[PDB]
Amino acid sequence: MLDAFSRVVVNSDAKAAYVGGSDLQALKSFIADGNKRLDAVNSIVSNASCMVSDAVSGMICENPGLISPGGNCYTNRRMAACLRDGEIILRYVSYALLAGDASVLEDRCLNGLKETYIALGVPTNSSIRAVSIMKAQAVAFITNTATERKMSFAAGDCTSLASEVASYFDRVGAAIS
């Protein structure tokens, strides 16, 4: 709902101010690294299908009680809902990475998720292992550190975007715990 550009114009709206020197320098740096921001987002959505299967199966192989009779992922209808509950999570994090602001997954995904999972019976102590696995996959893709897939990129460094996407993935585990 808000991007990095509109974040600035509501802070200078409180001051009844224009935009000048010190407030445009950090915004031109967004445009400067803007090609790397597109170049990192495409690295996630190109192979997001295997990122939600490995992350759900990583939670199950750590917690074998989730596929017990009486486990939360026991039948096929509950398992297939899990396989898309984690894809909705990955869709909104890639929106906040693209827009450069965490005010889109805060509004349409995170607000009220804790009260929703405790109503349905979803274990929230096991929903956070599925996101922390997906945090490790997403930072091992915008840096070429994936063990079984290497992607061509221009030379340079992207550890600032690795800390940006790790701030989004941690607040999903902070909004449901």
Partner 1 sequence: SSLDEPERQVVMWESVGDEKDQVFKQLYRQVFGNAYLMESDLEELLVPESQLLMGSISVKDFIKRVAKSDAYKKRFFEPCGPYRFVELCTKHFLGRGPRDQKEVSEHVQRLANEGYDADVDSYMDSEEYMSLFGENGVPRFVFKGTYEGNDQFNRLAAMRQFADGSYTDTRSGSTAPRKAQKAELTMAEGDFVGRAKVSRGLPAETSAAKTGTPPVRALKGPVNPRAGVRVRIKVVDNLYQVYEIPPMADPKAKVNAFWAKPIPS
Partner 2 sequence: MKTPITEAIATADNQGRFLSNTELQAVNGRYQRATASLTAAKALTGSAQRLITGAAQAVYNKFPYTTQMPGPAYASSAIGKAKCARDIGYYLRMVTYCLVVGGTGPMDEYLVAGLEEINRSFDLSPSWYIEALQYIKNSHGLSGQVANEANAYIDYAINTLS
Partner 3 sequence: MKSVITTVVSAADAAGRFPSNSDLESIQGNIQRSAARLEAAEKLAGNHEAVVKEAGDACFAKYAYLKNPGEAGENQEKINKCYRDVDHYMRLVNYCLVVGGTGPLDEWGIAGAREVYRTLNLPTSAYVASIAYTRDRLCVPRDMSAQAGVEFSAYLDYLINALS
Ligand X SMILES: C=CC1=C(C)[C@@H](Cc2[nH]c(/C=C3N=C(/C=C4\NC(=O)[C@H](C)[C@H]4CC)C(C)=C\3CCC(=O)O)c(CCC(=O)O)c2C)NC1=O
In angstroms, give the least distance from the CB of 126 to a second copy. Answer: 18
In angstroms, give the least distance from the CB of 108 to partner 3. Answer: 7
142: contact with ligand X by CB under 6 A: yes
Is 158 annotated in some ligand binding site?
Answer: yes
The answer to whether 12 and 19 have CB atoms below 8 angstroms apart is: yes
Residue 70 vs 112, nearer CB to partner 2? 70
Site string for ligand X, 23-52 (x = CB under 6 A): ----------x-xx-xxx-x----x--xx-
Angle at the Cα of 68 (from 65 to 70), degrees rounded to 5? 105
Query: Which tokens hold the place of 26?
Result: 């950090």
Is 109 annotated in some ligand binding site?
Answer: no
104 binds, among ligand X, partner 3, partner 2, none (CB under 5 to 8 A by kind): partner 3
| Share of the chain residues as helix, strand and coil, in percent rounded to the nearest 5 | 65, 0, 35
Give the single-character DSSP code of 150: -
79 binds, among a second copy, partner 2, ligand X, none (CB under 5 to 8 A by kind): ligand X
Q: What is the torsional sign of CA 24, 28, 31, 33?
A: negative
Q: What is the torsional sign of CA 128, 130, 136, 141?
A: negative
Taking CB under 8 A as the criterion, the residue among 28, 77, 119, 125 binding a second copy is 77
Nearest to 92 by CA among 38, 171, 18: 171
In angstroms, give the least distance from the CB of 37 to partner 1. Answer: 9
Detail the residues annotated as belonging to a binding site. Answer: 50, 61, 82, 158
